[PDB]
Amino acid sequence: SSYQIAVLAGDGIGPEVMAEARKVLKAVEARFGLNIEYTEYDVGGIAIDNHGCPLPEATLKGCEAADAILFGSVGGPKWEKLPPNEQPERGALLPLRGHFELFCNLRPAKLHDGLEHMSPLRSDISARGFDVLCVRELTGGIYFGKPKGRQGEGESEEAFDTMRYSRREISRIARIAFEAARGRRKKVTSVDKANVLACSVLWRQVVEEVAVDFPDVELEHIYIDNATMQLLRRPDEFDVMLCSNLFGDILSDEIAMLTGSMGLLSSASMNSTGFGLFEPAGGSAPDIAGKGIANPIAQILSAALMLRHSLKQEEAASAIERAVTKALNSGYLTGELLSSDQRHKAKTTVQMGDFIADAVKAGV
Amino acid sequence: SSYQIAVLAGDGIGPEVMAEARKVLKAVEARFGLNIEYTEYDVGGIAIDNHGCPLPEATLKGCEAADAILFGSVGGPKWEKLPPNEQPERGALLPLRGHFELFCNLRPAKLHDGLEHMSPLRSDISARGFDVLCVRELTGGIYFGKPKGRQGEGESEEAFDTMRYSRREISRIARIAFEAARGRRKKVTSVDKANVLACSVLWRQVVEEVAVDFPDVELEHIYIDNATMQLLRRPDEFDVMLCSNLFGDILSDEIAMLTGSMGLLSSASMNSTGFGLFEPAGGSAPDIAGKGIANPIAQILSAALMLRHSLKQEEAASAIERAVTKALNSGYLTGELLSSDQRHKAKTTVQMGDFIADAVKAGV
Ligand SMILES: CC(C)[C@H](C(=O)O)[C@@H](O)C(=O)O
Ligand SMILES: CC(C)[C@H](C(=O)O)[C@@H](O)C(=O)O
Ligand SMILES: [Ca+2]
Ligand SMILES: [Ca+2]
Ligand SMILES: [Cl-]
Ligand SMILES: [Cl-]
C-alpha cells in the first residue's frame, strides 16, 4: 500500500519549489508504479502566522503519521525580530530533529561539470572539481545537551550550554560515514577539536574503534579550524567528512558555499528506522519568492533522497537525479547558475520542473 | 628602564624566523632609543624534549617576569602521537592564555596589494581586496568552561564540555571590537549561534548593550555558519569580526587562509594590563625548517604588535610595518608568495630580515 508523505513547504520560495518537486514525483510515481499520498502542513513563518508557533501540534502529528517529511525552507525578514529562539527556523527544525531522533544529516556537495566558474574558489582550484559528502551528527552535542540556560544577574549573569556525546552516539554516526565512504572514494575525514574538547577526544577515539570494521576505508582526523582552511585549498582531497553537530553545521555550509551552486544541493536528515526529513541546503530566499525565478533543483533532489533513503525506491531516486543531470547539460539552468552575460537564457522555476518531469516520463 | 621580553621561539621554523624578528627589533631599538632585554625559554616540542612538558615551570616564571611574550610556533610530526592533549600546541598555548588572562585575540588579515592572485578566492573576488580584523574571546567559552570530562563506560560512556560566558566576559571583548572598528571602517559584525546556544543569546544581548557606547559604529549580527559562507563571497564587506572562543578559532583561520598569504599574518593575545603573547598566525612548518626558506614577516609583524600593544611604542611598531611594506613592494618576497614561474626570484629568510632591518635603519 501507499507511502504517506508530510509535505512542509514553509516560507519564501518553499512552496513554489515544492510544487516542482511534486510535479517531478508525479512523473516518477507513474513511471515506477508507486502509490504515494501527500498531506501538506504549515511549518515555520507560515505556521506562526496561521497557528501561533513554528511547529504546530497538528503538523507534528502529521509527520508522525508519515513515512518521510518533504521539507521546503523556513524563515524570512518578517519573523526576524522575534527572539532568535522563538524564530521559525530553529523552532521548526530542532524539535523535528529531536522528536524523530534524526541523528544523521547527509549533505552531498559537488562541483557540477560546466558550473565550475560559479564556485567562489580561484579558477585553478574549482577546475579540479570536488565531491564532498558531509555527514553531520544532528541530535547530540551542544545543540541538545543539558544543562543549558542562564543564571545570575548583572555583570556576573552567565549563560551555559553543554556539549555531550556518548560512545553510542558517536559510533552510530561514524558507521554511516564509513558505509558511505565505502561506496564513494573510501576515505573518511573525521573533524573534531580534540586538542581542546573532551567531547572531541571521545569522538576521535570512538571513530577509530568503528574504523576496525572498515579496513578498506582510510580514516584521517583533522581539527575543525584546519578543515575550514583545507576546504579552501584542496577540497578535491576530501571524500566523506564526518562531524559532530556544531562542527558539521559550519563545515557543511562552507562546502555548500564553495560549490557556488546552492540551488543544486539537498539534504537528508534520517533516523535509524529510515524515516527522514528531506530539504534543500539553501534558504527561503524571500526576495525572489513568487516570481518564478527560484531554482527548484534542490527541492527536486530532496525528493530523490526521500525516495532512496525513506521509501527504499532506488530506481525512482536515480531517475530523478538523471533527469536533473539532463537539464543541467541541455541548457535548462535558472538565472543564478548563469554568468552575468548568459542570464537571458534563464529558465523559470516551472520551466525547470516541466523539463525534469518530462525527462523522467521519457525514460531518462 | 628596560623592557623585558620572554622569547619562546618553539619548534620548526620558529627559531629561524624569530632570529629575523630579533634582527629587525635591534634596528628599531637603535632607531628609537628603546632598551629591551630578551630571555629565551623553551616551549612546545623543544620543551617536551628538554624538560618533559610543553610549558616548563621556568618558562612560565620567565613569562611572569616579562612585559610581553614574543612567541614562535609550536608543534610538528615528532609529537603528533602523544594524546592530542599532552601535545605541544595546546599544552603551551592554553595554559599561557589561562594563566595571564589573555582574553583578547586580535588577528588582522588583509589581502595585500599585488598578492591577490595568491588568495584561493576566485579572481574577481580577491581583486576587490579585504581587510578583516578578527577579535576572538580567548579565555572563556567552551575552552575553559567546567564541568569538562567524561564519565561512564562502554556504550554509555560520555564526555562533556561546558561553554560558559558571563556578561562581564562578553562586554570586555565586545568593547575591544567596537574600539577597533572606530579606528577602521566603523562596523562590527558579531558572530554567534544565537538560534541554538544560550551562550550566544547572552553574547548577542551583551554586545548590543555595549553598542550604546559606540553610536558611530554599525553593529550587525551573523550566525557562524552563515559567516563561514559570507567570507567566501563578500569578504570585503566585513571590517571587525567579533567572536567567542570556539567560533573565533574557526573564523580567524578561515580568513587567514582566504588571504592566501599566511606568512604575512600575525596575532596578539592580550590581557587588560597590556601584557600579551605575540605570534605568527601560521604553524611551525617543520618540513621547511632549517633551510632558509621560511617567510619571517609574520614573526617580524608579531614584534611590531608587541611594541604597539605591550610596550606602548607606536612609532617603533609602525616603522617595522612600513619596513615590511617596503619589502613587499621592492621585490623582496619569499618563495611561497611567488607564482610558480617567478619562484627563482625568491628571497631567503635572512635576506628578508636583512632588508627589513635595513629599511628600519634607513628611516622608512
Ligand atoms: C536553523 C539552525 C538551528 C540549523 C542548525 O544549526 O542546524 C541550520 O543552520 C541548519 O544547518 O540546518
Ligand atoms: C592549538 C589550539 C588550542 C589553538 C586554539 O584552538 O586556540 C590554535 O588552534 C589557535 O588558534 O591558537
Ligand atoms: Ca547551517
Ligand atoms: Ca586555530
Ligand atoms: Cl556539537
Ligand atoms: Cl566558545
Curated annotation (Swiss-Prot), chains A, B:
It is found in: Cytoplasm. Its main location: cytoplasm. Substrate binds at R97, R107, R136, D225. It is an enzyme of class 1 (oxidoreductase). GO terms for molecular function: 3-isopropylmalate dehydrogenase activity; magnesium ion binding; NAD binding. Binds 1 Mg(2+) or Mn(2+) ion per subunit. Belongs to the isocitrate and isopropylmalate dehydrogenases family. LeuB type 1 subfamily. This is 3-isopropylmalate dehydrogenase.
